[PDB]
């Protein structure tokens, strides 16, 4: 039971992972900008295709009766996923970082032609960064006719240190710092922006009340001037987020125009006409919030979904690297260490299933249909 329990666990991961990632690819074709998610799912798809081959080796306990070329290809693909996934996760973080911190200089960069080229570069860097895997992927000379398929370092008693750390540094340490730094500057800008739009909007409401109580053309002229500066200030302030520029910028053409219409009538001395024109702005403010709230709700969904996918990978594999670094100090493993190491990989490959599920669950429209199907199927 326990001897065959471990191969069964990884089979469940392969079955759920293939179905989950296929659904995500199907959903996007039929959040992240529909490019990195597809490429990220391809990394999961390719790795899980090679998963059953390595499961057979586990049952054989060191049997690779599939060919020397297969060992080099499959073992590389297993070690290629860690570099390829985090590079894509780093790419998604930086892509969201540029669109939210330096939108002006990133307009040319954020193109589907450019983004598709970047993915190929990430795959190209992925194969270059796993160079030691290619060099030492030869069949292990296991006693008898069986041949092992692992990493045969020239000095395994001494070369283990650099091989393990170089993977931990490039695949976990470096991207984690970059991604975390990217998403603290993003949230500082987003919090500053969303506290700026409602700060200028609150300037509109306070001055819009002054106009009604105004009794002379001077008060109306000064009240609207504060509104006009706030309107223009909020117009430029829209250029600080990705899903807040193509939607929340066109409206300010009307709002600034209507303030000019009321302001011009104020200069003419038509105080009664100025207040009538100003009263028409209570429908512009009423349409300000109903669009801002929808966008502010939509700009949190994009960030939370992006962070959740990033946070799942760096948490599933976090305990695994705790044991891997620990075993450097404690070379000899104990009875508990064997179970802990097996548990670490089980959570490590759970990333193939949590990422498709977390992306599906966080999509409110997608989960609604599944609930309806359950009700119909329940009968």
């Amino acid at each position, epitope marked *: 039971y326990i001897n065959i329990i471990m191969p069964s666990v990884f089979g469940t991961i392969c079955l759920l992972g293939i179905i989950g990632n296929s659904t995500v690819i199907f959903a996007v074709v039929k959040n992240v900008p529909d490019i990195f998610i597809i490429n990220l799912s391809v990394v999961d798809l390719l790795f899980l295709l090679g998963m059953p081959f390595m499961i057979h080796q586990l049952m054989g306990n060191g049997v690779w009766h599939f060919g020397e070329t297969m060992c080099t290809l499959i073992t590389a693909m297993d070690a290629n996923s860690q570099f390829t996934s985090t590079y894509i996760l780093t790419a998604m973080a930086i892509d969201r970082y540029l669109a939210t911190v330096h939108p002006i200089s990133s307009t040319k960069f954020r193109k589907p032609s450019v983004a598709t080229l970047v993915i190929c570069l990430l795959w190209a860097l992925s194969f270059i960064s796993i160079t030691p895997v290619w060099l030492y992927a030869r069949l292990i000379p296991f006693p008898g006719g069986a041949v092992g398929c692992g990493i045969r370092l020239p000095n395994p008693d001494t070369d283990l240190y650099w091989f393990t750390l170089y993977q931990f540094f490039l695949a976990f340490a470096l991207p984690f710092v970059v991604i975390t730094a990217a998403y603290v500057r993003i949230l500082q800008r987003m919090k500053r922006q969303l506290a700026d739009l409602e700060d200028n909007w609150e300037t509109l409401n306070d001055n819009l009340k002054v106009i009604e109580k105004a009794d002379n053309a001077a008060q109306v002229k000064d009240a609207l001037t504060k509104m006009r500066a706030a309107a223009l200030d909020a117009q430029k302030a829209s250029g600080s987020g990705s899903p807040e520029m193509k939607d*929340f910028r066109h409206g300010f053409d009307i709002l600034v125009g209507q303030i000019d219409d009321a302001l*011009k009538l104020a200069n003419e001395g038509k105080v009664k006409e100025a207040q*009538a024109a100003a009263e028409q702005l209570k*429908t512009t403010r009423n349409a*300000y919030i109903q669009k801002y709230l929808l966008i502010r709700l939509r700009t949190k969904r994009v960030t939370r979904t992006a962070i959740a996918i990033c946070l799942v990978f760096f948490v599933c594999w976090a305990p695994y690297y705790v044991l891997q670094l620990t075993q450097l100090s404690i070379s000899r493993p104990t009875l508990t260490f064997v179970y802990l190491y097996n548990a670490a990989i089980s959570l490590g490959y759970a990333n193939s299933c949590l990422n498709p599920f977390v992306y599906i669950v966080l999509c409110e429209t997608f989960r609604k249909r599944l609930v309806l199907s359950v009700k119909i199927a329940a009968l």
Partner: antibody
Amino acid sequence: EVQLVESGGGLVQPGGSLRLSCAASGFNIYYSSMHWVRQAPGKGLEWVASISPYSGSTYYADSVKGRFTISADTSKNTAYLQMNSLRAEDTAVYYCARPWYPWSYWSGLDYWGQGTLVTVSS
Amino acid sequence: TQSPSSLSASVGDRVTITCRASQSVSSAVAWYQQKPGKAPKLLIYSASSLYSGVPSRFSGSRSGTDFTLTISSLQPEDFATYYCQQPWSWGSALITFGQGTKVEIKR
């Protein structure tokens, strides 16, 4: 009585230029909002452009922004709509309408012209 | 995009023409009547007020996100296409005329 008289429509090849004129009588065009509404043959009303001569603010629809250029001439009491880079779908009947007050275009456009037919076909 | 809807009714009937908005309408819809081959005519402005030259049969209601035009006593000159000016939403055009409801003779 408020009257809006229009002209300038006719035949023009795609990519050509056509300036529509909407002569206004019975009121001063300076303190008003002149709106151009077009209705494609068999289609519903579509808003195109607006201008407030007193303030100078000018609004355009998305489908015509950068291609049309609406303006007004207070001396001649007319409102113009310069059309550039015409397409096949720009074929329609263009009406010029104004609201009762220059700021009440959201409560309805009370007064309308008779309309002019613009035919774009090569 | 969408063809004008058809609303068949006879003389003397009470017709109700409805346009649907994306948000809470607040007295910001105007109804236009266009006979075939003529410029549209304003019927009700401010969604509750009578327009000059418009009989009291026309009246505008407001129920939730739906605003309706009511004709108490349909007349033979009231068979035309009726357009609704949608309340302004941020980012759209200044004025947007919703699809029409063509009122035709029932038989």
